[PDB]
């Protein structure tokens, strides 16, 4: 009955494109790129009141963030960046901006048909990662 109902659930990665190049653009080093690129995460999205929780569970790393839309928080990313994050809803798309070291990357999550599509963008480089219900 609310703001992210169609995102809530357990999702499994089924395809990726350009993720190595995205990670290079971000600054991720060779060994982490190789092991992270192999991961097939489950993304678990839940909502309790105003608080949204997004977990990512994989052989590479298990991460968890909780947040309120529009309210900045500090995040340690799976690749060990210490970033300041703000997540908003823009026309039904969750938009996640991460700022660190004068740099920025944006991760968009959208529902398309029965998929949850994640678009990671750093400068001119996009990676598209497609999730199915688990
Ligand atoms: C496996 C799954 C998910 C991951 C990662 C690794 C990494 C991130 N995300 C979250 C964004 C996301 N969600 N689905 N794919 N990407 C941080 C940005 C990219 C650097 C590598 C580490």
Swiss-Prot record:
Residue numbers bearing the Phosphoserine modification: 15
Residues found modified as N-acetylcysteine: 4
Pfam families: Lipocalin (PF00061)
Residues recorded as bearing Phosphotyrosine in the entry: 22
Annotated Gene Ontology cellular component terms: cytoplasm; cytosol; extracellular exosome; lipid droplet; nucleus
Alphabetical UniProt keywords: Acetylation, Cytoplasm, Lipid-binding, Nucleus, Phosphoprotein, Transport
DNA damage found in the keyword field: no
Source taxon at top rank: Eukaryota
InterPro entries: Calycin, Fatty_acid-bd, ILBP, Lipocln_cytosolic_FA-bd_dom
Residue numbers covered by motif Nuclear localization signal: 24-34
Family classification: Belongs to the calycin superfamily. Fatty-acid binding protein (FABP) family.
Domain comment, as recorded: Forms a beta-barrel structure that accommodates hydrophobic ligands in its interior.
PANTHER family the UniProt entry points to: FATTY ACID BINDING PROTEIN
Record-given protein name: Fatty acid-binding protein, adipocyte
UniProt source species: Homo sapiens (Human)
Gene it is expressed from: FABP4
């Amino acid at each position: 009955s609310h703001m992210c109902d169609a995102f809530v659930g357990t999702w499994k990665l089924v395809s990726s494109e350009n993720f190595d190049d995205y990670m290079k653009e971000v600054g991720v080093g060779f060994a982490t790129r190789k092991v992270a690129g192999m991961a097939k995460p489950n993304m678990i999205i839940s909502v309790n009141g105003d608080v949204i929780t997004i977990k990512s569970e994989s052989t590479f790393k298990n991460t968890e963030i909780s947040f309120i839309l529009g309210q900045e928080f500090d995040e340690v990313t799976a690749d060990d960046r210490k970033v300041k994050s703000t997540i908003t809803l823009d026309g039904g798309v969750l938009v996640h901006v991460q700022k660190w070291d004068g740099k920025s990357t944006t991760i968009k999550r959208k529902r398309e048909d029965d998929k949850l599509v994640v678009e990671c963008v750093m400068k001119g480089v996009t990676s598209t990662r497609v999730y199915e219900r688990a």
